[PDB]
């Protein structure tokens, strides 16, 4: 009933600029004092900025001058404008709402938007379907996409268990990412199973239907 | 610039036991004027935001189970887990909100240790489409096993790998395998095999095939 939704993350080259947007619904917005927290690639959490019930801003030293935190009570939105991004600032960005009508305690949390800062180029992904008596398995491969992240779903998300999606692996600016899914042999190819993949900010959206390889040489 | 310290680094527990967390601080988060400890605990299930577990070093946030209790004061705080479940397989963090900057600790990963399981494999040739662009990569899939301590394998000039963090449901791990290659070099050989070597697998577990083009 308290929802925080980040927006507008992605990739910038160094020294660039990004304005994040956290959209809040489900409470008296002006009554609480909010903040932002980032999580390093090494999974370390760092506080960033905080903005009081009365716009007193508070920043961690590493971002002073570059980052400006700003709230608009009218539309229930919070912003973190990030100028002159250093290679350190590559991290996942959460907004937080105050615990109560009080200080900046990280009571509630957004889902997190990711900011990647290399100089590298936005590249859409390729999708390669892993097609191969008890139970069969099939997979989906995403060789070469940047920046992170992507969203892999099975049959438009209708496939719940049996999925073991794996963390991406950057080698030479191109993330490689697999996923496994298992059903009884009685299921595939009896019922169509498709890899669904989205890569943001490349604005691509791909679905590669898992089909049996078929015996054709010449 | 108060420095938080959480110890130890790793861990190993089993469902039902007790768990003790240790947050060391570089200053007193206790203020004489209100006798309040400005400290909070967090639980971050992998792939999600953290949740606020404990605050004022003791008070349970609403909806927090009873099997979580916060104690300690001043500079050395403690998180209490009465009965560890598997819905608590994650990391844990402590923070202070005395002064700025707000600070977190190094965290503590509890790797549950339940039972040695049997790693299901599945080997996959390159797709009839990847070869058509340039390149090829076999994949084999380890699924639903414990422990995380199992390496797998004969020319190995460039592969990639990927592990899942522990499943919050069945306490398992799982492994990927990016056996990347050149397209034409994939025809220079015929017999293609992965093989695992577990803690319960003295005699390894194998999955194999021959190049479908011969």
């Amino acid at each position: 009933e308290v929802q925080l939704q980040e927006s507008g993350g992605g990739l910038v080259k160094p020294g660039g600029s990004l304005k994040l947007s956290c959209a809040a619904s489900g409470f008296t917005f002006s009554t609480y004092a909010m903040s932002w927290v980032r999580q390093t690639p090494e999974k370390r959490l760092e506080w960033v900025a905080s903005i009081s019930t009365g716009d007193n801003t508070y920043y961690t030293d590493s971002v002073r001058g570059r980052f400006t935190i700003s709230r608009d009570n009218a539309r229930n939105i919070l912003y973190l404008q990030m100028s002159s991004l250093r290679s350190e600032d590559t991290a996942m960005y959460f907004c937080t709402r105050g615990r109560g009508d009080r200080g900046d305690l990280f009571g509630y949390w957004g889902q997190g938007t990711l900011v990647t800062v290399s100089s590298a180029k936005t590249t859409a992904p390729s999708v390669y379907p892993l097609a191969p008596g008890s139970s069969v398995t099939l997979g989906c491969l995403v060789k070469g996409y940047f920046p992170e992240p992507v969203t892999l779903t099975w049959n438009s998300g209708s496939l719940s268990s049996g999925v073991h999606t794996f963390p991406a692996v950057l080698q030479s600016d191109l993330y490689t990412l697999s996923s496994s899914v298992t059903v009884t042999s009685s299921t595939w190819p009896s019922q169509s199973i498709t890899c669904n993949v989205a890569h943001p900010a490349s604005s691509t959206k791909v679905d590669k239907k898992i089909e049996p390889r078929g015996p054709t040489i010449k | 610039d108060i420095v938080m310290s959480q110890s130890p680094s790793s861990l190993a527990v089993s469902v039902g036991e007790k768990v003790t967390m240790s947050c060391k601080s570089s200053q007193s988060l206790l203020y004489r004027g209100n006798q309040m400890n400005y400290l909070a605990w967090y639980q971050q299930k992998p792939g999600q935001s953290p949740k606020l577990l404990i605050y004022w070093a003791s008070t349970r946030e609403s909806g927090v189970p009873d099997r979580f209790t916060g104690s300690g004061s001043g500079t050395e705080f403690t998180l209490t887990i009465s009965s560890v479940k598997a819905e608590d397989l994650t990391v844990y963090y402590c923070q202070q909100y005395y002064t700025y900057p707000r600070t977190f600790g190094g965290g503590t990963k509890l790797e549950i240790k339940r039972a040695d399981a049997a790693p299901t494999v599945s080997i996959f040739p390159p797709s009839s489409e990847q070869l058509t662009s340039g390149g090829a990569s076999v994949v084999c899939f380890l699924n639903n096993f414990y422990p995380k301590d199992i390496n797998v394998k004969e020319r190995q000039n460039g592969v990639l790998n990927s592990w899942t963090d522990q499943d919050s449901k069945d306490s398992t791990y799982s492994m990927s395998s990016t056996l990347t290659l050149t397209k034409d070099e994939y025809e220079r050989h015929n017999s293609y095999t992965c093989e695992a070597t577990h803690k319960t697998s003295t005699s390894p577990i194998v999955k194999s095939f021959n190049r479908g083009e011969c």
Binding site: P132, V136, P212, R213, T216, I217 | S128, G212
Partner: peptide, 6 residues
Amino acid sequence: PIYDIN
């Protein structure tokens, strides 16, 4: 010859 899906 798609040597046997599975």
